Paper text:
Unexpectedly, the structure showed that A49 possesses a Bcl-2-like fold despite not sharing sequence identity with known cellular or poxvirus Bcl-2 family proteins. Strikingly, despite a lack of sequence conservation with known family members, A49 adopts the Bcl-2 family protein fold comprising five α-helices wrapped around a central helix, α5 (45). The A49 structure shows that A49 lacks a surface groove compatible with binding BH3 peptides and is unable to bind the proapoptotic proteins Bax or Bak.
In the full-length structure, residues 1–17 could not be modeled due to a lack of interpretable electron density N-terminal to residue 18. The only other significant difference between the structures of full-length and Δ12 A49 is the conformation of the region linking helices α2 and α3, helix α3 being one turn shorter in the full-length structure. Visual inspection of the structures of A49 Δ12 and full-length A49 showed that, in all cases, two molecules of A49 self-associate via an interaction of helices α4 and α6 (the “4-6 face”). In the structure of full-length A49 this interaction is formed by crystallographic 2-fold symmetry, whereas in the structures of A49 Δ12 the interaction is formed by pseudo-2-fold non-crystallographic symmetry. Whereas the self-association is predominantly hydrophobic in nature, in the structure of full-length A49 a symmetric salt bridge is formed at the periphery of the binding surface between the side chains of Arg136 and Asp92.
Author numbering:
A (entry chain B), B (entry chain B): 18 to 160
The structure:
Amino acid sequence: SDMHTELASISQLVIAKIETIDNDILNKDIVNFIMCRSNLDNPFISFLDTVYTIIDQENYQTELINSLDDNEIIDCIVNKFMSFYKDNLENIVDAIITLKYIMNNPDFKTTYAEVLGSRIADIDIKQVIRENILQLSNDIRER
Amino acid sequence: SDMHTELASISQLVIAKIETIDNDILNKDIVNFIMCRSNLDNPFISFLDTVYTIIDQENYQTELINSLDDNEIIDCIVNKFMSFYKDNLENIVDAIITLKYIMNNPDFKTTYAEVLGSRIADIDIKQVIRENILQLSNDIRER
């Protein structure tokens, strides 16, 4: 409801600050987010967090994941992770959130935490983020 | 020894024929290769196969993999697969071969065959291949 002015305003803050941010640090903040530790100081994280919040009215993801067996998880993981090396921001964001919802599972958390850590360390998404953030903002405000 | 004239000659055939090839089919041939079914009619496969052969004098990969537990495999898989969405051909080729060596493990084969199938279906590497093949040829001839 009030999340309109919210999201647009943070977008604007993101694009303004993205370049300046070291990528290694960005990737650390992102991991942390997946692990349910949101450093809101980082605007993009703040962006993510807001978005998550909106989605978790749905809540469906949690139930979904709790059903998945291991092959399904692995498929999910590998499928989602590809977003990062491609150039669609929506799917990147979606991926990240999907990954948090996974790490909210205590079993999957234990198993796959480490690797997510390792593999996120190797992505580079600053371009995608500056280039798409404001458009994404709208796609969702309106969604 | 005679693999010099071999590899250079097939490279040349690859670049000549790559564009023409439908990507969905290419990806099918590649999967099949990972599963130890080399359609040599496809020049790139032939390329792969040759390369594999060279490497399997080493043979080390097999022993290596047989040691890996599941997290390690998963890490390997996800790490390697990223090559596909990036633009280094060497690492792509290396990845593919690494994946075959995995599918030579009967246990890992059973578990992960399906997903490799699914996920390879979504890559697109024709650009990378035309743009790099001849250079790669040399890097290896000389290696």
